[PDB]
Symmetry: D3
Subunit: 124 residues, 6 copies
């Protein structure tokens, strides 16, 4: 189906699913994170929807939402916090460095698209 | 301020804020992503809350929520989609490799923790 | 020759040679590491053959042997040992991180091939 | 025990064990790779030993053996061959780049040591 | 135009400009660095030209000059100094690792071109 | 020794030399790059000085000059050109990616300092 195959294979808290159809650029713009667990009453402990910006912000017709950069900045902030606290680890430091370099490349993309004046249009 | 200082400085679609207080491990467990734009009535175009798992999933008193690798798996899937579509870029390729290596390091944490019998406990 | 061109060009303890013919996947499955030095009597100081698994382990026809992740795990263990000991270095630290990321990618390969039910088969 | 905890968790062909005790720098200098499979007589399908250089090469009393870059050069050559063949993969490319960068850092160590005149000597 | 589009966008000390014509390999071989500030007289605080080797050193007619690894070695030395000094930062440490790895890859290029017996020639 | 211990050891075209004294932050602010070869009168074929910014630009009293990121942007531009031309190489591609990531970390430093109000001051 549309349940994501993840790099983590054991002890997974949640599954992630694509919602809707492929949209601009070939990607999905809505996802659900839902728990692999249940309460005693049978509903999901976790059922969170994430909508991404689909179409440009400057247009009302567009689905306004989050961008990849926001999620990574959240994860970065939490990792910096965890490293400053009592349960730090070398794995956290390595993950954090990769998260920040991914963030830098995404920012490199936005800036390149500004220089070429293509930010916000459906063009390579 | 609780607004996060992000790597991206220009043309930001959204602002990210920590919500609540630092808790287990020294990290925040809820964040809000909100638009830098507003609608006619003056309401936000995007006002998205993300809640993270706080406390072990087995326990009912615990706040159940997402984990960081879910967010990165979403971003990873979207980057793979974009790279297969008409708007690919070398910047995407580098961001994607870093996102996957961050995911691989996070998995390494879970596996080390399983090996040491500390998964799900407040211990290094 | 079939001697391997190495990244280290100076003060090399040993030379490495490819042994045999290429086979499955375009690769060789036996190697010899021999010292660049001879003893008081003229015999080689070091002469190791390393045989790799050739064909699936589950088939009786196969040349059973080692796989690359085994060698890398040995090197990882030795580098971690050296870093915990009195002769640590930053060069060791950089090497160690790359060896671990190579292992993580080799394992990604294994997990992908299991997911697609192709592990142990001659299929891309 | 002396069994190494590896990054790979599923479908492991072999196990690696440390042999003996700590030597110079805090590392072990002999390892065994043995299959997780056995023949009819209960003998190992694979049992191979790798011995590392312990003590400087010139001193003749030293335990002469392989060095880590020899193993990494083998793995690098095999990965290059696989990438040229029909069973290539992106995981192979990422692993190969990391293996090569580990080799480049191992050479850098050697070159610094030659420069500081401390090669072959038990000195940081 | 002729001005380089740089990764740094705010508080830039200087501008970098391409000088002259496209040359061997498709690159430019003269660059100019000039301050974004000017003095009381209206003259530039900085106006520095860097010429690069265009053509082989052995031939007299060719423009003798610097090579890129020279510039990176200077930056590496300065970064090592700053890391030993009071104004170190994690950003400096990451930049330094990348500069050294870029240098090592430039050294791979030199070493390979030696081995294929093409160093100093206009050949792929 | 004010001469630089470089990563390339063979077939070097130029030598790089420290000029002047240790300065602010513990680093050198002038360097000379000189040809290993010779002009018939005996002057060096290449002899070029690069002076770095020492002290803040606004202060007239400072030594005005180039900054490290200027040199890396030149090298980046040359690497991108070479990769678009007939003499590309995989070594160039890796070198270029590392040069861009070093530049991004240097810009990450400038921004952090701006944020904390220390840019242009002698403080972390
Ligand atoms: N102002 C602003 N700041 C940003 O940081 C930013 N990041 C993305 N966007 C814009 O959001 C809108 C929603 O994206 P959509 O999926 O509809 O189209 C996207 C998507 O189909 C595709 N694409 C390819 N790679 C990526 C990528 N890495 N991130 C986002 N979109 C990508 O290429 C289209 C145009 O991208 P941008 O040209 O970045 O403009 C987008 C677009 O206007 C931004 N707008
Ligand atoms: N089954 C399962 N699979 C996972 O992948 C996973 N990841 C986290 N958890 C558990 O979720 C719960 C919520 O985390 P909390 O913040 O309360 O405590 C966490 C947090 O305070 C801190 N910590 C340090 N680094 C990290 C990190 N990278 N990710 C998460 N938590 C981290 O260290 C505590 C214990 O961590 P785990 O020992 O992984 O167990 C956690 C915990 O039981 C998981 N549980
Ligand atoms: N159980 C198990 N766990 C492992 O970790 C593992 N790693 C490899 N193998 C299997 O060993 C046997 C020996 O490899 P051979 O060279 O004949 O064929 C290999 C080889 O020709 C080629 N190949 C391509 N890339 C690689 C690679 N990175 N490592 C090994 N083989 C590779 O692709 C074939 C199939 O690979 P796998 O599909 O991984 O199955 C192999 C095969 O059955 C494993 N088997
Ligand atoms: N000629 C030559 N070329 C090489 O590439 C090379 N690599 C290692 N050696 C020498 O092999 C001998 C066996 O190592 P031992 O474990 O006894 O001591 C080692 C070991 O205890 C420790 N050490 C710390 N980090 C490393 C490391 N990365 N690799 C090897 N040894 C290391 O630090 C000691 C001295 O290292 P070198 O100073 O390189 O000399 C060694 C030593 O004489 C080499 N000799
Ligand atoms: N002795 C010596 N040691 C070095 O480290 C070195 N690095 C470069 N050179 C030689 O300098 C001269 C000036 O370069 P030019 O632009 O004219 O030609 C270059 C240039 O057009 C192109 N090229 C492609 N990638 C690169 C690259 N990464 N660095 C330099 N030149 C490159 O490919 C041509 C041949 O390169 P080399 O084959 O390395 O020989 C060069 C050449 O003789 C060197 N010479
Ligand atoms: N406007 C502006 N844009 C820039 O990109 C920039 N980069 C540097 N500078 C300023 O140039 C001046 C010359 O540097 P100096 O060596 O005297 O002091 C420097 C130097 O001694 C030390 N330092 C530590 N790490 C670095 C580094 N990576 N690059 C440069 N200097 C560094 O820390 C001091 C303060 O650095 P900044 O706080 O960036 O301010 C510098 C300084 O005012 C800049 N000014």
């Amino acid at each position: 189906m549309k349940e994501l195959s993840t790099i983590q294979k054991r002890e997974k808290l949640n599954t992630v699913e694509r919602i809707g159809s492929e949209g601009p650029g070939g990607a999905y713009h809505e996802y659900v994170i839902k728990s692999n667990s249940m309460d005693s009453q049978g509903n999901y402990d976790v059922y969170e929807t994430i909508k991404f910006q689909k179409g440009a912000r400057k247009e009302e017709k567009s689905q306004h939402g989050v961008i990849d950069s926001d999620l990574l900045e959240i994860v970065r902030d939490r990792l910096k916090s965890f490293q400053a606290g009592p349960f730090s680890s070398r794995e956290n430091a390595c993950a954090l460095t990769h998260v920040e370099e991914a963030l830098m490349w995404m920012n490199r993309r936005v800036e390149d698209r500004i220089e070429r004046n293509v930010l916000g249009t459906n063009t390579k």
